[PDB]
Structures are given as structure tokens and as C-alpha cells.
């Protein structure tokens, strides 16, 4: 809460418990796989 | 010279890693190459 980021986005799903990790930089797995990804940049948060 | 990283070959580094590190690699490749070339090209000015 000190800048101001003119566009986020509204992005969720739900994992396999085991993986609640798949949602980082590069970081692989069967949803970085063929379920989804992330940027290597990601200016974000997997705040779950 | 691989300047500390896993090995002296792009095409190695590549095939045994995974883009969200293998910057810290290449990078590290990049820089000990670069600073080689500055060596070089510094002797060239001196000694022309």
C-alpha cells in the first residue's frame, strides 16, 4: 500500500494440497504443466 | 572457464536446469566472459 498499480487481476483456482507451491516463478508441476503458469516476473502474491 | 558455474557449454546448462535459476548460470557466464573481453581490448589500446 504505497504505490498506485492501475490494473490487477482477479486470478484463482484450487489445488492438489500437495503442490501449493506450483504457483511460483518457473517453478514447475503438472499446473505449471498443462493446467496453467506463471511469469517469471509475477509482480505478485499466490495469497491462499 | 565456467567462473563458478555448473559447466563451460550454453548448450549444457540448458538441458540440465530450468529457466527460473539458470539466469544465475548464464549470467554468471556472461560476466567472466565480458570481463575478458575488457581485458583484451584495454592490453590492445596500450600496447597500439
Redesign the interface.
Known amino acids: 500500500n504505497d504505490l498506485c498499480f492501475t490494473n490487477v487481476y482477479a486470478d484463482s483456482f484450487v489445488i492438489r494440497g500437495d503442490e501449493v507451491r506450483q504457483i511460483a516463478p518457473g517453478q514447475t508441476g503438472k499446473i505449471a504443466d498443462y493446467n496453467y503458469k506463471l511469469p517469471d516476473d509475477f509482480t505478485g502474491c499466490v495469497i491462499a | 572457464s565456467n567462473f563458478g558455474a555448473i559447466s563451460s557449454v550454453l548448450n549444457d546448462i540448458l538441458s540440465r536446469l ?4 539458470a539466469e544465475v548460470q548464464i549470467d554468471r557466464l556472461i560476466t567472466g566472459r565480458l570481463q575478458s573481453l575488457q581485458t583484451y581490448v584495454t592490453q590492445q589500446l596500450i600496447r597500439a
Not at chain 2, 530450468?18 to 535459476?21: A, G, K, R, T, V
Request: overall charge negative.
Open positions: 530450468d529457466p527460473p535459476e
